[PDB]
């Protein structure tokens, strides 16, 4: 999309409008043997989840179902309030993704994760959940992720973006899996939005690609593609 990082909560009310709710039937994952789709963060690690993207089960956490004997309770009030999650979308910006989708650089995509892996382990740093001690706050480092990449070739405004699904959950000391206390997620957009901006152009760099930088906004675009 247009914006460099976008979050969107999603709950009830708009669940059916998240990356990733539909899915073919015949099939067990959305891009399997790609990575269109992997799984990010420690606590999706802490599920053995690695890899593509099984549906069935970002289906599962998406509302709070750990497994079949092990549902999230995340509700204080009206259940259509239920935060699900946020969707972090990072979007590279149009020469870049003119690069990526046009020229079918396979080097800009792999930046461009990168630079989305980074971000997700930034916003590792802000998770946190409520504990009972008097409530305490407890500093957790771990969200569950499932990413999703967008391609759109279009000659018209090629957009390159990956929405990275962070559930409404992480797992406490005790073991205990709970509600994601999104404070701090929610004041640092702007942070991780950079984190992925500067991430981007140090890989493209290194890479050896020349890169032209807008020294008023402090932003970046490829020298020639713009
Ligand atoms: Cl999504
Ligand atoms: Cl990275
Ligand atoms: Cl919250
Ligand atoms: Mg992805
Ligand atoms: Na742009
Ligand atoms: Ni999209």
Avoid: C
Avoid at 91 to 98: E, F, H, R
Avoid at 166 to 187: F, I
């Amino acid at each position: 999309s247009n914006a460099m990082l976008d979050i969107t909560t999603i709950t009830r009310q708009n669940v059916t409008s998240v990356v990733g709710y539909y899915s073919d039937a015949k099939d067990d994952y959305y891009s399997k043997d790609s990575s269109f789709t992997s799984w990010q963060g420690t606590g999706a690690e802490a599920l053995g989840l690695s890899g593509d993207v099984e549906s069935a089960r970002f289906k599962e956490l998406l509302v709070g179902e750990i497994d079949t004997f092990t549902h999230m309770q995340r509700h204080v009030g009206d259940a259509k309030k239920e935060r699900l999650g946020y969707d972090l979308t990072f979007s590279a910006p149009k020469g870049v993704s003119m690069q990526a989708l046009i020229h079918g650089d396979k080097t800009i995509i792999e930046a461009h994760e990168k630079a989305v892996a980074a971000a997700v382990r930034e916003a590792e740093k802000l998770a946190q959940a409520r504990t009972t001690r008097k409530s305490v706050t407890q500093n957790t480092n771990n969200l569950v992720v499932a990413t999703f990449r967008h391609e759109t070739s279009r000659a018209l405004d090629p957009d390159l973006h990956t929405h990275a699904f962070v559930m409404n959950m992480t797992q406490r000391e005790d073991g205990q899996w709970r509600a994601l206390k999104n404070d701090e997620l929610m004041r640092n957009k702007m942070h991780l939005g950079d984190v992925y901006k500067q991430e981007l152009a140090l890989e493209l760099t290194k890479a050896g690609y020349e890169l032209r930088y807008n020294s008023k906004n402090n932003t970046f675009d490829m020298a020639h593609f713009s």
